[PDB]
Design a protein around this ligand. Structure first.
Ligand SMILES: [Mg+2]
Ligand SMILES: [Mg+2]
Ligand SMILES: [Mg+2]
Ligand SMILES: [Mg+2]
Ligand SMILES: [Mg+2]
Ligand SMILES: [Mg+2]
Ligand SMILES: [Mg+2]
Ligand SMILES: [Mg+2]
Ligand SMILES: [Mg+2]
Ligand SMILES: [Mg+2]
Ligand SMILES: [Mg+2]
Ligand SMILES: [Mg+2]
Ligand SMILES: [Mg+2]
Ligand SMILES: [Mg+2]
Ligand SMILES: [Mg+2]
Ligand SMILES: [Mg+2]
Ligand SMILES: [Mg+2]
Ligand SMILES: [Mg+2]
Ligand SMILES: [Mg+2]
Ligand SMILES: [Mg+2]
Ligand SMILES: [Mg+2]
Ligand SMILES: [Mg+2]
Ligand SMILES: [Mg+2]
Ligand SMILES: [Mg+2]
Ligand SMILES: [Mg+2]
Ligand SMILES: [Mg+2]
Ligand SMILES: [Mg+2]
Ligand SMILES: [Mg+2]
Ligand SMILES: [Mg+2]
Ligand SMILES: [Mg+2]
Ligand SMILES: [Mg+2]
Ligand SMILES: [Mg+2]
Ligand SMILES: [Mg+2]
Lengths: 50, 262, 205, 151
RNA sequence: CGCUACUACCGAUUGGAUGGUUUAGUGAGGCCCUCGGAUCGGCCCCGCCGGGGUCGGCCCACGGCCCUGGCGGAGCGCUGA
RNA sequence: UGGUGACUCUAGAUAACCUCGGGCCGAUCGCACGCCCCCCGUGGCGGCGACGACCCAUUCGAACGUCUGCCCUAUCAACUUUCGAUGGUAGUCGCCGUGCCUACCAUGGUGACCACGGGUGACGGGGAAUCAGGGUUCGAUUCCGGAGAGGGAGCCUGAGAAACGGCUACCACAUCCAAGGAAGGCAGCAGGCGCGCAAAUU
RNA sequence: AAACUGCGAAUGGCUCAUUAAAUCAGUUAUGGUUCCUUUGGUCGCUCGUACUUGGAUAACUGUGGUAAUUCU
């Protein structure tokens, strides 16, 4: 499972490869355009919304 | 077919263009315009085959894109433009004027005219109808629509149009004793005086014409174009005055010309 | 799809013919526009040549003309009562050409009372509202009263139309095709035709 | 009464019969003005069409049709359909090889207006061409002339 | 009548075969109608940043009335697709 | 008012309507640039074209109709009408006229002058071979019409297509695949297989 | 250059399977229809921010998925 994350204010894209079920649990059973809290990705993403 | 056709086979072209068979497979299909496809002369045919100014179709385009040719006083760059009966062609570069008039053989002839004569043309009234607000409208043989015509002008009459302004100067009524030319059928290209008109309700009318030499013939009403009032035409006539000769007297004239040559 | 050609039909002698070409675009047909009564709903159809056909699916108003009085007014459509072609159309309340419908009478009554200045459609109880009283009993000068009195000479309506006005609904016939132009226009029934359709409606029940 | 035999009201579309009038003019006569036209080509309108009360939208004189095309002739053979009859046209076809002819016939279904009555089997009829009125009908009866045995 | 060969006919019977029809029962897909509403906007309610006028206590401070550019949150409020 | 052999034609008048899936009534581009005013401006005016557009007329057509005309076959003599066959009335649909379709009605329509059915090594003509005068046979084939794109069917766009060097399915074949999928139509020019007595350069 | 927009791609070329009043030929009709384009005519004929109004999308710059396509 890869994640292509885009920051529009800076307009920067980054592809991150994640091998962890816990990090992907919060994104399961979600439809498009929904807002999620990306805290499970790690300690860097505290307060980020995706 | 599923729509309009865009080509014309050379052998299927009108025979008054006098095209040869071995030059190519196709012939210039006339563009849509004032005159019918079977009753017009394309600009390229007149420009390279009649006048010998150009040798190929490319040179006709090179001439036309210099805006040298004018038809009825307006510059046309289309090389397949349909030019028809009683049209005026002007070339200011060489100072030449021509009028498309049928000869006694039923072919358009290279007929040079005075630049003073090139300022007007004759048209045949095809339709008269009253439009919105009670305004009369007159439609000619070359798709010209004129508003507020003279109340005395009816169908099958002739009107003189000034090419610069496109307005009627005078007119000739369709009556016996006037001068007419045949524009279609077996008697195409003949000039004469109307003798009588036969009316057939629900069908075509038949009109009898007699030429200067006394030869009589008949045509349909749609094939007659009134040229002048009485015996005086309002336009210049080609080399032949509209009298059709028989084969025997054409041979006699040719032999007499050969004997006097040399 | 739906084809309205002629080569699928038997010959005059009765023998069948083998077709020589398949279905063509210009021979097509389209499903019928069953126009009902309700809030307006119209769909446009792109037809041959790039033109439009207005396919009315629901209509509730239309302009009808009182021919004898030459009074054309826009009135709502209430119900469908008779249909010459088929009685199933009446049951489903389908608006087609030449169908007999019921329309409101109020605008015609207003025009009649404003023109002739006579009561119409009023009960015998003579109950009134001041607006109607000043419409009918307004103070006019000698010249205007002279014209109104002269108009009162020709103010006379048949008993059938008067009874319909008392009922509040008039019988009308639709002359336009709702499925083709998108509007339901017609004329108010009167005269021998009104008697004919009244007899037909009564006999149907 | 006799005219009104269909589920729909039979009316002449171009005549307005609901024009109101004073009570004095109503007592006189309830005579609807008749609509008729001259079809041209020298054919005269039968008096029964002008004075009649029938309703026929396909009648050449009181209906909405136009006569243009060919004018043909035939002999009446069958009168069993409603307002339309079947006539027979006889001719000879030439065979080049034998320099002779053979007898041939055609059948035409034509529309007969109510203005023409007392039409019997075996009399001559002159018909004119119009727009297709039905699947097989393209001609309308213009004139009727009786047989040689008329007394 | 007894020899020698060929073609064409019948006719125990059922095979390898295809092709053409139709009775009934299903029936892809497009099109039309009646629903449906993932989602995307615009208008109102607040809040703080910014520019034009004016009004008020007025002296380079701060509110009122409108507009105006952005940003954040509500209302199953309204509306359009 | 004007016109036709013939209008329910064109034009005129009156009362209204005028579709949100909405008719028009210019928020477009180029080249030369100049005359005028109590003026220096919100400056006013102006020449040729290009593009676009509601509606008439014209041109190129297309589509439905009228009359006459086609090869053998009776070991094909009655056919059509339940599921439209013939006609009437009112509607629907269609770009329009019409059983084109629907509802209610009448019993009609065709046929030894050959209907109906069957066969055709049948696309139709302009034409070709042979021929004293008659006639017999051929016409797939460069021109004019028709039909088709492996067989059917249904559509989008567009002025115009039931289009196939467009799409969507079924039927028959058939290509790549990492087995999850993706992509097909030479009766266009060459060329290849097969078929055959029988026909050319990738 | 690329891309958006406009037009054409319904012409041409090939073949003769179907098709026997069907196709087709001559002769008439559309007063019973539609018509890109060309040509001509109308285009202050309506009495009710304008010194020019609004939001997006490619090409481009960057991040990617599939064994595979003129996929996105
Ligand atoms: Mg072609
Ligand atoms: Mg051309
Ligand atoms: Mg076919
Ligand atoms: Mg002979
Ligand atoms: Mg379905
Ligand atoms: Mg009028
Ligand atoms: Mg009808
Ligand atoms: Mg009928
Ligand atoms: Mg043959
Ligand atoms: Mg064949
Ligand atoms: Mg011979
Ligand atoms: Mg011989
Ligand atoms: Mg041939
Ligand atoms: Mg042939
Ligand atoms: Mg063959
Ligand atoms: Mg095709
Ligand atoms: Mg093919
Ligand atoms: Mg093949
Ligand atoms: Mg296929
Ligand atoms: Mg187009
Ligand atoms: Mg196809
Ligand atoms: Mg191909
Ligand atoms: Mg093709
Ligand atoms: Mg090949
Ligand atoms: Mg290939
Ligand atoms: Mg050979
Ligand atoms: Mg070989
Ligand atoms: Mg493009
Ligand atoms: Mg196109
Ligand atoms: Mg070739
Ligand atoms: Mg023909
Ligand atoms: Mg039509
Ligand atoms: Mg046009």
């Amino acid at each position: 499972m890869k994640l292509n994350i885009s920051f529009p204010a800076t307009g920067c894209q980054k592809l991150i490869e994640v091998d962890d079920e816990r990090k992907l649990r919060t994104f399961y059973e979600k439809r498009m355009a929904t807002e999620v809290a990306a805290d499970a990705l790690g300690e860097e993403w505290k307060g980020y919304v995706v | 077919a599923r729509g309009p056709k865009k080509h014309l086979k050379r052998v299927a072209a009108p025979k008054h263009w006098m095209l040869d068979k071995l030059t190519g497979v196709f012939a210039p299909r006339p563009s849509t315009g004032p005159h019918k496809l079977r009753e017009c002369l394309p600009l390229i045919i007149f420009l390279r085959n009649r006048l010998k100014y150009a040798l190929t179709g490319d040179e006709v385009k090179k001439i036309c894109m210099q805006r040298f040719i004018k038809i009825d006083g307006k510059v046309r760059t289309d090389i397949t433009y349909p030019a028809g009966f009683m049209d005026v062609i002007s070339i200011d570069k060489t100072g030449e004027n021509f009028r498309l008039i049928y000869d006694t053989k039923g072919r358009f002839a290279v007929h040079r005219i005075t630049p003073e004569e090139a300022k007007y043309k004759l048209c045949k009234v095809r339709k008269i109808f009253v439009g919105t607000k009670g305004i009369p409208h007159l439609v000619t043989h070359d798709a010209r629509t004129i508003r507020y015509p003279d109340p005395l002008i009816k169908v099958n009459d002739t009107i003189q149009i000034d090419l610069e302004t496109g307005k009627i100067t005078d007119f000739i009524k369709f009556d016996t004793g006037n001068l007419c030319m045949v524009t279609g059928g077996a008697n195409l290209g003949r000039i004469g005086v109307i003798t009588n008109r036969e009316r057939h309700p629900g069908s075509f009318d038949v009109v009898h014409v007699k030429d200067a030499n006394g030869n009589s013939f008949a045509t349909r009403l749609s094939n007659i174009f009134v040229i002048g009032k009485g015996n005086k035409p309002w336009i210049s006539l080609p080399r032949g005055k509209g009298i059709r000769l028989t084969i025997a007297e054409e041979r006699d004239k040719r032999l007499a010309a050969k004997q006097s040559s040399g | 799809g739906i084809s309205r050609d002629n080569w699928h039909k038997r010959r005059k002698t009765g023998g069948k013919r083998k077709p020589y070409h398949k279905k063509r675009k210009y021979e097509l047909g389209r499903p019928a526009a069953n126009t009902k009564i309700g809030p307006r709903r119209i769909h446009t159809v792109r037809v041959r040549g790039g033109n439009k056909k207005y396919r009315a699916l629901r209509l509730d108003v239309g302009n009808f003309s009182w021919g004898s009085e030459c009074c054309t007014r826009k009135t709502r459509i209430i119900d469908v009562v008779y249909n010459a072609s088929n009685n199933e159309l009446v049951r489903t309340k389908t608006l087609v050409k030449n169908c007999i419908v019921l329309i409101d009478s109020t605008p015609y009554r207003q025009w009649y009372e404003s023109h002739y200045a006579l009561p119409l459609g009023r009960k015998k109880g003579a109950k009134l509202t001041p607006e109607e009283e000043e419409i009918l009993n307004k103070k006019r000068s000698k010249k205007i009263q002279k014209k109104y009195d002269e108009r009162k000479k020709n103010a006379k309506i048949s008993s059938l139309l008067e009874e319909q006005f008392q009922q509040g609904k008039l019988l009308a016939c639709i002359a336009s095709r709702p499925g083709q132009c998108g509007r339901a226009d017609g004329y108010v029934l009167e005269g021998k035709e009104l008697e004919f359709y009244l007899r037909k409606i009564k006999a149907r029940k | 009464a006799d005219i009104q035999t269909e589920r729909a009201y039979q009316k002449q579309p171009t005549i307005f019969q609901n024009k109101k009038r004073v009570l004095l003019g109503e007592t006189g006569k309830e005579k609807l003005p008749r609509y008729y036209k001259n079809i041209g080509l020298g054919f005269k309108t039968p008096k029964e069409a002008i004075e009649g009360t029938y309703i026929d939208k396909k009648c050449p004189f009181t209906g909405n049709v136009s006569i243009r095309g060919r004018i043909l002739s035939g002999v009446v053979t069958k009168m069993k359909m409603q307002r339309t009859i079947v006539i027979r046209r006889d001719y000879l076809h030439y065979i080049r090889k034998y320099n002779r002819f053979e007898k041939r016939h055609k059948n035409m279904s034509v529309h007969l207006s109510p203005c023409f009555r007392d039409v019997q089997i075996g009399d001559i009829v002159t018909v004119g061409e119009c727009r297709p009125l039905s699947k097989t009908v393209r001609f309308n009866v213009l004139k009727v002339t009786k047989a040689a045995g008329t007394k």
